[PDB]
Amino acid sequence: FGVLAKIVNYMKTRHQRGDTHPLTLDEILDETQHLDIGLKQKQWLMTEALVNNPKIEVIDGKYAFKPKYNVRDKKALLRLLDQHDQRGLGGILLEDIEEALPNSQKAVKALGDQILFVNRPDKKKILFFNDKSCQFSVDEEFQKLWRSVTVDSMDEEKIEEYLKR
Amino acid sequence: PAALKRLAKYVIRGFYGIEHALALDILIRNSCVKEEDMLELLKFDRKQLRSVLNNLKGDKFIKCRMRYFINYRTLVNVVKYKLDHMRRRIETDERDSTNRASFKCPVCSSTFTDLEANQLFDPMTGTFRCTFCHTEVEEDESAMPKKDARTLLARFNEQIEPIYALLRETEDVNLAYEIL
């Protein structure tokens, strides 16, 4: 078992170094000096361990990096977001940084395109969401707003009536 | 009721923060979804979402179904009042609060009206004498409409009326679809 977690750590380091190209199990075991980890461990790793992981990318007869076998498009699904009856996906910034590239380079363009940052899940965490249109009045908003939240205080079918009369 | 859904979306935008608006969007569909579904799709924190839900429930925008299993849905029309209540609030600022006839004594900084003049006067000096600290009074203008500082707000109201005009018009067209 522990050698498979060393392989997943090496493959995670390969994406952090800049690469998602597929390799054979041999090329992985050679670089990590696990080539002699034992033929029984190599066979189990090949025919059960890289088979029991549903997140492994199988491509070119080989195995590649690593948490996503699909939808590694490294940009937001704007097209789904266009559809206000089905638009839905904000996630965690950590998955998006994990996916491909640092946020900042993409974000400079995105701060004036689609992205909104919310400090959610905690101060150390950020959630990204897509944005919107204009407001419904130019006022100090918050002063007026705090007075106009309003009338949760009963006899309200009668306060609609009282206004109507 | 697409126009009403837009109309609701506009009024909350002017009012509420984006955190509430984001919860509100899945809700606009008036679907029989629960907090778990809104938690799953939106990824809001359970405590934080529930706070927003508590703000919305308290706001009366929501009605629920308890099976316990709990389900949440909109009442959506509590909106006409929301506009009408907010306008009222805006009207309190619009309704006369100038309190015409109005002096104040610079020493004690207290406030006074026309009614207090007939007692705050003193004939031997031919001028106004305050009640206790005895000093001249020279107009009021305290917490009252004045030169530009308050008037920026009265103008704000002047500015608010055109921005909710289309929404009232939205309310008017909605009054036509009511038959429907």
Swiss-Prot record, chain A:
GO terms for molecular function: DNA binding; RNA binding; RNA polymerase II general transcription initiation factor activity. One of its GO terms (cellular component) is cytosol. GO terms for biological process: transcription by RNA polymerase II; transcription initiation at RNA polymerase II promoter. Keywords: Acetylation, Disease variant, DNA-binding, Nucleus, Phosphoprotein, Transcription, Transcription regulation. It is found in: Nucleus. Residues 1-72 bind DNA. Recruits TFIIH to the initiation complex and stimulates the RNA polymerase II C-terminal domain kinase and DNA-dependent ATPase activities of TFIIH. Both TFIIH and TFIIE are required for promoter clearance by RNA polymerase. Belongs to the TFIIE beta subunit family. Tetramer of two alpha and two beta chains. Interacts with FACT subunit SUPT16H. Interacts with ATF7IP. Interacts with SND1. Part of TBP-based Pol II pre-initiation complex (PIC), in which Pol II core assembles with general transcription factors and other specific initiation factors including GTF2E1, GTF2E2, GTF2F1, GTF2F2, TCEA1, ERCC2, ERCC3, GTF2H2, GTF2H3, GTF2H4, GTF2H5, GTF2A1, GTF2A2, GTF2B and TBP; this large multi-subunit PIC complex mediates DNA unwinding and targets Pol II core to the transcription start site where the first phosphodiester bond forms. It is linked to Trichothiodystrophy 6, non-photosensitive: A form of trichothiodystrophy, a disease characterized by sulfur-deficient brittle hair and multisystem variable abnormalities. The spectrum of clinical features varies from mild disease with only hair involvement to severe disease with cutaneous, neurologic and profound developmental defects. Ichthyosis, intellectual and developmental disabilities, decreased fertility, abnormal characteristics at birth, ocular abnormalities, short stature, and infections are common manifestations. This is Transcription initiation factor IIE subunit beta. It comes from Homo sapiens. The chain holds residues 75 to 239 of 291 of the full protein.
From Swiss-Prot, chain B:
Transmembrane segments: none annotated. Residues 4-80 form the HTH TFE/IIEalpha-type domain. Zn(2+) binds at residues 105, 108, 130, 133. It is found in: Nucleus. A zinc finger (C4-type) spans 105-133. The modification N6-acetyllysine is found at residue 57. Tetramer of two alpha and two beta chains. Interacts with TAF6/TAFII80. Interacts with ATF7IP. Interacts with SND1. Part of TBP-based Pol II pre-initiation complex (PIC), in which Pol II core assembles with general transcription factors and other specific initiation factors including GTF2E1, GTF2E2, GTF2F1, GTF2F2, TCEA1, ERCC2, ERCC3, GTF2H2, GTF2H3, GTF2H4, GTF2H5, GTF2A1, GTF2A2, GTF2B and TBP; this large multi-subunit PIC complex mediates DNA unwinding and targets Pol II core to the transcription start site where the first phosphodiester bond forms. Belongs to the TFIIE alpha subunit family. This is General transcription factor IIE subunit 1. It comes from Homo sapiens.
